[PDB]
Design a protein around this nucleic acid. Structure first.
Ligand code: MG
Ligand code: MG
Ligand code: MG
Ligand code: MG
Ligand code: MG
Ligand code: MG
Ligand code: MG
Ligand code: MG
Ligand code: MG
Ligand code: MG
Ligand code: MG
Ligand code: MG
Ligand code: MG
Ligand code: MG
Ligand code: MG
Ligand code: MG
Ligand code: MG
Ligand code: MG
Ligand code: MG
Ligand code: MG
Ligand code: MG
Ligand code: MG
Ligand code: MG
Ligand code: MG
Ligand code: MG
Ligand code: MG
Ligand code: MG
Ligand code: MG
Ligand code: MG
Ligand code: MG
Ligand code: MG
Ligand code: MG
Ligand code: MG
Ligand code: MG
Ligand code: MG
Lengths: 25, 48, 120, 57
RNA sequence: UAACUGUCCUAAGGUAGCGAAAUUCCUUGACUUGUAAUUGGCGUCCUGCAUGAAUGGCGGAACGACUGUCGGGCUGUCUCUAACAUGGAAUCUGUGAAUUUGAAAUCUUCGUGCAGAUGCGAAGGCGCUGGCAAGGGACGAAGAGACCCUAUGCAGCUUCGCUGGGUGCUAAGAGUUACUCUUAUCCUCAAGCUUUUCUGGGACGGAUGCUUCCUAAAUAGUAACGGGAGUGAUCAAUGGUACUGCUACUUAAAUAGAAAGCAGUGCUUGACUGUAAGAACCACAGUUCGAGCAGGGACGCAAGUCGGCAUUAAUGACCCAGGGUAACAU
RNA sequence: UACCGUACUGCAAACCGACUCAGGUGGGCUAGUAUAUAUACUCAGGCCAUAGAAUCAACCAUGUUAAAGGAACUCGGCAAAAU
RNA sequence: AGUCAUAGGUAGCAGAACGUUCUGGAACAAUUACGCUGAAAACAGUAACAGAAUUGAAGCUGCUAACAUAAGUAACACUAAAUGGAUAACAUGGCCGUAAGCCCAAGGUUUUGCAUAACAAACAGUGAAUACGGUU
RNA sequence: GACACGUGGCUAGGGGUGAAAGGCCAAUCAAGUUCGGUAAUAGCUGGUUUUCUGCGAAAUCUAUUCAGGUAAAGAGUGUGUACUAAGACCAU
RNA sequence: CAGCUAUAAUUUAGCGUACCUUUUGCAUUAUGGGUUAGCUACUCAAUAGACGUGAGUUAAGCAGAAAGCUUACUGAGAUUUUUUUA
RNA sequence: GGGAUUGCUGACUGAUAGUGCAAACAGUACUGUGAAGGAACUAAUGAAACUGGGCUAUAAGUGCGCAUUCCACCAAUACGUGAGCAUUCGCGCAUUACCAUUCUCCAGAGGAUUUAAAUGCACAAACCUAUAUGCCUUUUGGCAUAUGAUUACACUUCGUUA
């Protein structure tokens, strides 16, 4: 037996800053 | 030149440094002493 | 490492990520940021990547510019932002057209600008 | 090992498929040459015994 | 016989109604019938290896291509086979495969031999080749898996094997203000990983360091789940040194010991710091002895001994973690 | 009053089974003795092409008959016979 | 060029060579070769010197192709039954007759018709006109 | 009749369906078939193709998730170095 | 195991337990092959060690290089010399 | 990175090789319900197995077709076309005739070997398609700032007349 409780980490998933406009108008 | 039916006969399956299971190279102490600087200097003799 | 961690998603988190990638441009995205929760097991060789799911509410904001209420899906933090800088009119005027990654926010933005311009 | 034309012309006077089929004739010709070694070595003993019989008679 | 009393661990020691029964080792259970003769049934009896109201106990009408037994009739199943009929087979004409195949011109017996010989040895036999038959042999042919063992083997299943929030409920906060989010975790569901080895097969049992004695054959060394004793320590004195009395013990065994034995004393910590040529040994890692040099000490008038105990057992690498000190750094 | 089907086969040598494969393949119509679509012979209609030819082998398959017995056979009246 | 010494071999190690295809050195087979032998072997008889290799095969229940063996063997036995000098139109006999007859469906998709061999598939054939089935 | 048949339709693989047999899901299903990862992996089995010449072992020992594997030592070959020997025998 | 050796030369005598693979040991009644033909297995790159053959030596190699990179060198004052003799 | 033309490119292959395919119709016939799998076949020559019979018992010429360079017409700026084997130890194609004399085993079956050549293979060359600083790169993109969320602004100027 052994303990394996994980350590959480949140990565901000870079999220390109200002905008693009290749989507639907 | 390989002999008869070993693991050496099969080819590329066993590393040269494997010694059976006694890890003798892993029984010696590890030293982390960095040598002093001046070993990065060029050494020139007065004789030259 | 993030492009690796997107490819290491468990199937519920991957399906939620595909739905987030589909329906991002349908809801208000003021300060909303998706997040991955990668948990690090100390007895190693196990990195399970998942998603931090956003919370969504259908709030019915009153526009002080044009005389109607609008219903539109938001998050708590962008509602903090909108109601703490001045409301829907001040947000839709002072946040120009590119920090709005949203379709109904853009549509109500144009309706506020057009109704206000005809109101002059 | 041994040239194939040599094996065929050594097995020239054999019997059956061991005359024309090359890989039967190969084993037969190898056994024939192994017989030839022992026969050459036994020539001397056989003829010495024959001479001693004639002297004795 | 043990009905009522006497006892011990113990959730509790199995009722009217069951039992050599689908299930009872003794076994041909003693008992009646059954047959001339019965180990397989029927109905009793008790001595329940290892029966029994929800693993449902007690039997019944009807039902069954279910199972075990008895009578009548019936007849070639049989005593014991015969004749006949039809269709193959056998003859001719026409069409026309496949399994198998190292090459064969392939005798018998006895012996030998990878231990059952057509092929080797000794002796003998044999005009040659077929059709139709029988299948003892060619370890006939047909599947590189009938069974056993092994694998850094797979696969699925099971669980008080391990770890996980993946999954379902739950707990505590939060939001819009039932629903949703965050975090945690019992019990379920779905997975992912492990689950040694030696062995006169495997399983079972036993063992896996170190020391000594016999094997071990008079340098050393020398095996077997071969045979007899030990050990995983003790001791601030049972260490060191200088002495004092007495003499058959000191111990795991061997070698040894007028002290290395038995009782004592006076001081002390060498039960140190830094080293060490040279050897024993030895695959390597390690292991063992070690005079001498420097420091500071101990005992002794000195000679000189002391780097733990007469020796051979009580000595688990590296990694990782922690402590003191020293240098450098921030 | 246009367009599509209309040949042939369809319990089979033409479909499904590698085959001219003894297997599998749906619905409908039908005469007499006669009475039921069962049974024997027959109507309408169809068929006797896909190996032939004689003969007393053994043996095999499928049946007929069998004296006196009758489960005596056999793990078990299985199989036949019998109603 | 005369004396001595050595020469059994599996696993393994070392040394010397043969052969196949292609290339460089200008071109080594236009009009062929063919005295049948030589060499220790691999082989040779249409260069040689170097180089580049998808470079050598009785041996993997290997793969592909061809050809044997078993062997003119087994098979050509589910059925009704055939005969007359013909798988006959004619005659005789037999078999099915709730099929082995007739009409359709599904499926097949030309398998359908013509010549006393033949030169014939290259040629023919499916007609909605009864309110036939579909299409609605 | 808890019936049989015909014509389309629905449920698909860690899934369907099952009056429940490890049954069925297009003749190899306690995890269909096809394609891809994939030239998976196999300390196991089989095989390895021209010649000549010289030398020539071992099946002991230690360790091992290890005893049919591997590594070190012993025993082989080539190369180097070096002794009338770090050699073999015999005598005193 | 169908051959061998023969001055044996219209016919005899003697000798002769296939091959492969795997094994302590196989004619083995252990593996494999019906035959013939074609195809079918130690390759290549980078890096490391060793040997053989060299290059350069103003140390070497890479490179356009007086960049740069990788290997290589840099130390002791040590009484010794004519065949003997003034 | 990708898609088509050209390669006086190849110590690449040459029909069991090279693409699965050199071919009248190869992703074909065929297999499977389907997704999917997936062949063989060039032109001559005619090896062996196999089965019957017999026996034994002068590294040269000469023709054509082009390419290179000369010439003379040229768009006159890369050659544009045209006489010429004029020139080249060029390339491809075509062509070269022996006449006996029997002591050779024969006949079939089969498709190996030999010869011939890329439309096969691998690339290459132009052609077309697809923000700056530094950290990690790894045949190329993730991260802060700045001309920045804004419908707006610089440039390919042909000049020559002593
Ligand atoms: Mg002889
Ligand atoms: Mg002699
Ligand atoms: Mg008959
Ligand atoms: Mg015997
Ligand atoms: Mg006979
Ligand atoms: Mg016979
Ligand atoms: Mg194991
Ligand atoms: Mg211990
Ligand atoms: Mg520390
Ligand atoms: Mg039928
Ligand atoms: Mg069939
Ligand atoms: Mg049929
Ligand atoms: Mg009738
Ligand atoms: Mg007939
Ligand atoms: Mg009677
Ligand atoms: Mg030798
Ligand atoms: Mg010798
Ligand atoms: Mg050349
Ligand atoms: Mg090859
Ligand atoms: Mg016949
Ligand atoms: Mg007739
Ligand atoms: Mg039809
Ligand atoms: Mg799957
Ligand atoms: Mg030995
Ligand atoms: Mg071993
Ligand atoms: Mg012999
Ligand atoms: Mg073999
Ligand atoms: Mg065989
Ligand atoms: Mg071959
Ligand atoms: Mg420079
Ligand atoms: Mg090809
Ligand atoms: Mg071919
Ligand atoms: Mg190919
Ligand atoms: Mg051809
Ligand atoms: Mg021939």
């Amino acid at each position: 037996a052994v303990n394996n409780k994980p350590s959480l980490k949140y990565v901000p998933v870079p999220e390109s800053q200002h905008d693009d406009f290749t989507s639907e108008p | 030149g390989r002999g008869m039916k070993g693991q050496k006969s099969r080819g590329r399956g066993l590393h040269m440094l494997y010694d059976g299971g006694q890890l003798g190279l892993l029984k010696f102490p590890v030293t982390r002493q960095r040598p002093s600087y001046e070993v990065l200097y060029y050494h020139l003799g007065l004789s030259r | 490492n993030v492009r690796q961690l997107i490819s290491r998603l468990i199937p519920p988190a991957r399906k939620q990520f595909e739905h987030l990638q589909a329906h991002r441009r349908d809801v208000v995205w003021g300060d909303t940021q998706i997040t991955l929760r990668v948990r690090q097991y100390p007895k190693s060789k196990d990195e399970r990547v998942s998603l931090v799911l956003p919370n969504w509410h259908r709030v019915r904001l009153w526009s002080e510019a044009l005389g109607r209420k609008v219903e539109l899906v938001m998050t708590k933090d962008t509602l903090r932002h909108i109601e703490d800088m001045g409301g829907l009119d001040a947000y839709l005027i002072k946040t120009p057209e590119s920090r709005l990654k949203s379709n109904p926010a853009s549509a109500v933005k144009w309706e506020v600008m057009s109704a206000l311009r005809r109101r002059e | 090992p041994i040239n194939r034309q040599k094996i065929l012309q050594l097995a020239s006077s054999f019997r059956g498929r061991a005359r024309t089929c090359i890989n039967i004739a190969r084993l037969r010709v190898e056994k024939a040459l192994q017989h030839a070694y022992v026969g050459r070595k036994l020539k001397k003993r056989h003829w010495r015994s024959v001479w001693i019989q004639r002297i004795n008679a």
